[PDB]
């Protein structure tokens with residue numbers, strides 16, 4: 020691979036999926052698409068269906084114990100994983116997305132983003148054999164307490180989230196990076212359905228604008244997500260602005 | 270529209286996105302793709318870029334107050350929303366996905382799934398003007414405490430999650446529907462890297478298999494996600510099996 024864009028922290032992500040075409044949604048579009056075109060991110064897919072040997076390329080199998088659903092067939096899925104691990108060489112963490120995994124949050128994104136290589140296994144049907152989790156999976160992660168039709172959308176979600184930490188992908192040490200909700204944002208026009216832009220944001224006063232933003236982030240976190248505040252050791256400035264917002268609310 | 274598949278609870282989802290092609294990942298593939306082909310789910314996209322009038326089809330705009338990023342331009346985005354609301358007719362809830370929203374979980378999926386119509390607004394850049402949230406958005410939701418490059422992956426995630434509640438989409442009142450983590454699942458072969466299938470699952474004993482599954486779901490929820498247990502009023506059978514697992518662990 021070749022190019023002028025600095026790629027020191029380039030990330031390689033192997034994906035195991037029965038529907039690799041879904042991943043076009045992050046490789047061909049927007050910020051992630053530009054990351055792939057510039058060689059900051061590489062996403063390489065293996066499809067268990069390509070590791071089958073029967074005439075009908077069977078990728079599901081019946082569960083021991085009955086139950087109404089099927090599981091991913093072990094041999095095609097294991098073979099695909101083994102191919103991806105041989106392509107990745109040494110140091111690739113293998114991740115299984117599922118609702119039984121560790122719950123993803125921005126700190127866990129930045130933990131995962133420290134890996135130069137990841138392999139993401141996407142389950143379909145009722146999931147994968149437990150012994151493959153034991154033998155082939157390093158870590159299990161969830162995007163949230165909800166059930167989807169498969170692990171592709173979780174895997175794409177985790178790719179997108181980690182990609183933002185690759186230097187050069189963005190045009191990061193964000194606002195949510197403070198552990199607070201973002202402040203309100205305003206653009207043209209100055210008046211919209213009779214709602215005006217806060218005068219401070221037109222003031223050109225860079226410090227009063229920084230303070231107002233931080234005070235709105237503290238107020239919104241307190242009102243919407245108060246448990247996120249308990250996670251934080253507020254700065255002296257943060258304590259003061261939060262107290263000011265709570266007095267204005269009351 | 271026409272077809273033989275029962276579609277009484279068919280869902281219509283309007284999407285506002287600068288990258289509608291991403292939505293091919295759910296409309297053309299798997300369970301969601303079959304839902305769309307069978308007229309159980311309809312996903313219809315509007316792109317703000319199509320509502321621009323300048324020669325360069327501008328969709329971003331500068332934030333009042335400075336800051337390094339841009340915001341979605343109001344006029345194209347507002348026009349797109351208005352078009353989607355006129356297509357949807359009466360009763361469409363408009364949703365904005367963001368990290369400042371209510372945190373999605375399976376109960377909130379089933380709440381959202383009660384709407385026959387939804388419009389999902391996908392933000393890009395530093396987000397949308399606050400006054401559009403006030404004037405055009407009914408509810409703000411998050412998929413999780415992490416930051417992505419835009420609201421498309423959240424919107425697809427929410428589509429997929431709600432789609433599962435549409436009758437006929439699946440081939441539901443699940444296991445996670447108990448509020449518990451799933452039990453281990455096993456398929457062929459009977460022995461894998463010297464790990465055997467639990468004999469109970471080969472026993473053909475339907476009640477002992479149901480009990481073992483439920484006991485593993487309780488043990489795994491207790492060990493991995495103990496706060497999920499505090500949410501539940503366990504059945505007498507559940508209390509007994511949980512106590513049994515906790516004694517075996519100790």
Ligand SMILES: NC(=O)c1cnc2c(ccn2CC(=O)NC2CCNCC2)c1
Nearest residue numbers: 116117118161162163166167169170173
């Ligand atoms: N929340 C996630 O990260 C998530 C959600 N669903 C996912 C994944 C990965 C795959 N699926 C499908 C799945 O696990 N379905 C089963 C749930 C328990 N009962 C059988 C169906 C991640």
Ligand SMILES: NC(=O)c1cnc2c(ccn2CC(=O)NC2CCNCC2)c1
Nearest residue numbers: 366367368411412413416417419420423
């Ligand atoms: N968690 C979600 O549901 C989620 C995450 N990110 C999303 C969305 C929808 C859009 N984006 C991008 C975004 O909001 N980025 C900004 C975060 C605060 N600072 C400026 C960047 C949902």
